[PDB]
Ligand binder design. Structure first.
Ligand SMILES: Cc1cc2c3c(c1C)C(C)(C)C[C@@H]([C@@H](F)Cc1ccccc1)N3c1c(nc(O)[nH]c1=O)N2C[C@H](O)[C@H](O)[C@H](O)COP(=O)(O)O
Ligand SMILES: Cc1cc2c3c(c1C)C(C)(C)C[C@@H]([C@@H](F)Cc1ccccc1)N3c1c(nc(O)[nH]c1=O)N2C[C@H](O)[C@H](O)[C@H](O)COP(=O)(O)O
Ligand SMILES: [K+]
Ligand SMILES: [K+]
Ligand SMILES: [K+]
Ligand SMILES: [K+]
Ligand SMILES: [Mn+2]
Ligand SMILES: [Mn+2]
Lengths: 500, 500
């Protein structure tokens, strides 16, 4: 099976890439696995594969940390992500995001049902497993539970059967046969839950699949449109129909090569304590537990020698930055274009803790609109902040064509020098806010509303006659022939490789 | 002479430090010297000493570029600056700024007059020099003149004789015997100029000394208080009285070891074209010339084998960041403390193009004030933005004790996650603005007023009961004994020096 279609093959690919460290001595799931992974993420090291996890029994489970985190070199910085998608390991962010967007104007390729797969190699019924006895990690010392679910895919379907959603949402062990987790608006798992709660007749049939096809977990982390079944979008993106097997205890379908599958229900009535969790902005508020959604597990199926992927998330850089931010930015780029806005590129700078998105403007097109900053900021912010794709993002930074939005240094330069505080900004208080940001849910104002801004880092002539400056930098302040002479004599004179 | 007291000795020190590249083949002052220096500054390379400058005659002149720029290693990042001050080359920013502030509660040590010095080795009267014939650099391709003055010290004295100011302000060659330059409020050269213009009787006696004692050029770049003679402040800082010689054509006094001295007058009546200049925010606006102040040169004196220091300024990182921003931040720290504000540290993040200052708050003291964000932001911003030390700074970011304001990554983290846009900010429109920032002088609003903000990145409990989070990072989310085990087994397991 190809790496992008089979998690087990993806793990091989990381090895082959010299991007894996296999740890075969005993490692404790209580903090140690996550501490090693945290260190990896903070230093862009190789992904850790914990083959000897204290508490692993009967095949459950090994852990792969940092599956979507960064590599140290510039040349293959995003290689782990490229390996989710069959792209060369040197792919740029633009190329990765374009791949993730490509299925948006293709016909879906619906999945293919097969009779069995590796995820059926082992099973545990409802008298044989106990989720408190598995080697579930404690990821951060102050977490409110052991977070089994940081990189699996929840599968729920609308009551009418017409939409099956795949998404990542956190969940922790509640007791031997239940989880609690986040299920919050406007997320699709919440939207589908609401449909079942209005029908009122039953709990939501559910599955949670860990170690799914890498291309599937990327779509699971992306805000593709309402009503769009991720499996068909991934099929179109990859050019292949995904192979799914039916659950044993319900009629949902899971990837055939899933490492571990939980089958059960998401309650339409019950809740239980959930959180706190150290997360994507870099914080944990010890003791802030809240009621979350409650899942009942009826069955586990799993591969021989199953591997659980884990995100040890928090401060830079991990999956909560590389995937959540970048994939939201991709969708925002498309949304803006579909609303006739002259946006060429979008990215969530890591330096902003993926709370900003920088939008690169085609300023030739802007000039033809014959508009002003106030009007344009309002239009952009109305489009983005009124849409689910904009949910996580609290500051949009508009930049002209000279800025590479994938380079945070350049975004910061433009923001700091081209956007006058106050005058060049529009605040949005009557939009949905993202409560997870500390200044929202632990801040001075409403946790769920407002706190958003469009910051215009377009200069005045960019709306009228064109850019009227040159940068005071080596690139722009010296002629080509001089630059090349400098470069060619650099080591000669006495001063100081692309791969490294 | 010690390095901090004599520029010629400072140049030796850089060599000795393996922090100099001597270029002994011909280099063109038309762009080439500045392009090499620009490249140095963008890559934190060794400082260039151009010993064979095309157009050098009769000893005028060699060029040293990048005198106050950064070194590549973390361990001696600020070593060039430390070498201006007799500090170890590993000194921290806190230590450098503390040294620069130390004279603020010491008695001045006034300078000592000596009969001669190296700056008198050669002279050119007013029939022997022509400033258009010297190898003055063109620093950026679009500059409006050849900027002779990027790292010398202007010397002007109040009409009553009681205040002699030393400061850096740019100036370019106008004709054979005149310069034009910036002389703008609230700068001390402007304040003294105004005193002479109100008296109305004569032009301002002036000298411009290049290659002055390094400790003197640091004070020249710092906003020490109105009325304070820099020479006595430097004397106190260094513990020694500076040796000065009298000018030949006026009664001002210049450092004895100055490399090059211009003597003449700053007009109280005349102006001439000045600029544009590629500068500290990273821009040049080709063609934006304005009238500037006009200087007449009557005499040149200089050392044998004189060296002119040059700042090839623009995008990160050069003297306009390391010195202007850091030294302003130092003064702001002191100002805040003298106004009873609980500020421990201040720094202008390079990532903000030195347009922000981050202020670290002693939150124990804040808690005892029993105040609120709105009130505290207003108080801080009134103090800073109403003072000359705050002139260049358009955003103040308040952070708690966990943030190291000298680390831009941490400032950006705090700003992005702890300050709710709008609600947690106070805009200041009725304060002096810094017109050099593009969004000011080339922006949508008044060039000289407003555009300032205090952004409060203190969390709510920091005002009341104390920090209520822990970071989701390796440092804070794992116990000490576990962290140390991870570190001690890191290379063992398979993962990857302080000087490198
Ligand atoms: C890659 C990734 C994604 C998420 C999450 C995680 C990772 C590693 C973690 C490690 C489990 C952390 C959390 C976390 F990142 C939480 C969060 C909540 C809302 C929006 C964005 C982020 N998690 C997650 C969460 N979303 C929650 O609702 N709920 C969640 O708990 N997302 C983001 C989510 O997968 C995307 O927003 C996706 O678009 C959802 O799919 P949908 O468009 O089909 O609803
Ligand atoms: C280190 C340094 C400092 C400056 C300047 C430069 C350097 C390398 C350059 C390369 C010549 C560029 C320019 C430039 F940075 C301009 C500027 C203008 C106002 C405030 C801050 C910065 N320059 C300069 C300028 N000031 C102008 O007015 N006028 C100036 O032209 N400063 C900053 C200045 O030295 C400090 O603001 C200092 O506090 C002034 O001394 P004072 O407090 O005694 O008035
Ligand atoms: K999704
Ligand atoms: K703007
Ligand atoms: K000064
Ligand atoms: K705040
Ligand atoms: Mn969806
Ligand atoms: Mn002064």
């Amino acid at each position: 099976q190809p790496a992008h279609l089979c998690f087990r093959s993806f793990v091989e690919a990381l090895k082959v890439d010299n991007d894996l460290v296999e740890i075969n001595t005993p490692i404790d799931p209580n903090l140690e696995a996550a501490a090693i992974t945290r260190r990896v993420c903070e230093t862009n090291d190789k992904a850790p594969l914990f083959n000897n996890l204290i508490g692993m029994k009967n095949g459950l489970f090994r852990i792969l940390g940092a599956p979507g985190s960064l590599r140290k070199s510039s040349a293959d910085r995003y290689g782990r992500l490229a390996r989710h998608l069959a792209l060369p390991p040197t792919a740029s962010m633009r190329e990765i995001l374009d791949k993730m967007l490509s299925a948006s104007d293709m016909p879906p390729i619906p999945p293919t049902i097969v009779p069995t797969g590796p995820c059926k190699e082992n099973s545990l019924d409802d008298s044989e497993f106990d989720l408190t006895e598995l080697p579930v990690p404690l990821i951060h010392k102050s977490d409110g539970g052991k977070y089994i679910q940081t990189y699996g895919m929840h599968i729920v379907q609308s009551p009418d059967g017409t939409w099956t959603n795949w998404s990542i949402a956190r969940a922790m062990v509640h007791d031997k046969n239940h989880l609690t987790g986040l299920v919050i608006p406007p997320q699709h798992i919440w939207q589908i839950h609401q449909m079942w709660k209005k029908e009122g007749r039953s709990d939501v049939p559910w599955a949670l699949a860990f170690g799914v096809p890498p291309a599937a977990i990327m779509a699971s982390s992306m805000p593709i449109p309402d009503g769009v079944t991720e499996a068909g979008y991934v099929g179109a993106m990859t050019g292949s129909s995904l192979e799914l097997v039916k659950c044993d205890t319900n009629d949902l379908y899971v990837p055939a090569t899933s490492e571990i599958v939980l089958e059960g229900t998401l309650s339409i009535s019950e809740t239980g304590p959930e959180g706190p969790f150290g997360q994507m902005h870099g914080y944990i508020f010890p003791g802030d537990t809240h009621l979350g959604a409650k899942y009942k597990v009826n069955r586990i199926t799993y591969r021989n020698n199953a591997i659980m992927p884990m995100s040890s998330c928090g401060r830079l850089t991990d999956e909560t930055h590389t995937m959540i931010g970048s994939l939201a930015a991709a969708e925002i780029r498309k949304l803006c274009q579909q609303n006739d806005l002259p946006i060429t590129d979008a990215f969530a700078p890591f330096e902003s803790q993926v709370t900003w998105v920088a939008l690169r403007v085609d300023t030739e097109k802007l000039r033809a609109m014959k508009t002003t900053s106030e009007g344009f900021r309002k239009r952009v912010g109305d489009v983005v902040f009124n849409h689910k794709a904009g949910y996580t993002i609290h500051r949009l930074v508009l930049v002209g064509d000279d800025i590479d939005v994938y380079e945070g240094k350049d975004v910061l330069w433009a923001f700091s020098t081209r956007c006058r505080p106050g005058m060049d900004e529009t605040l949005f208080e009557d939009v949905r806010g993202f409560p997870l940001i500390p200044y929202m849910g632990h801040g001075n104002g409403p946790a769920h509303r407002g706190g958003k801004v469009v910051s215009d880092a377009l200069m005045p002539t960019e709306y009228t006659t064109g850019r009227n400056w040159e940068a005071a930098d080596f690139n722009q302040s010296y002629p080509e022939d001089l630059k090349q002479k400098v470069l060619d004599n650099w080591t000669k004179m006495g001063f100081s490789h692309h791969h490294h």
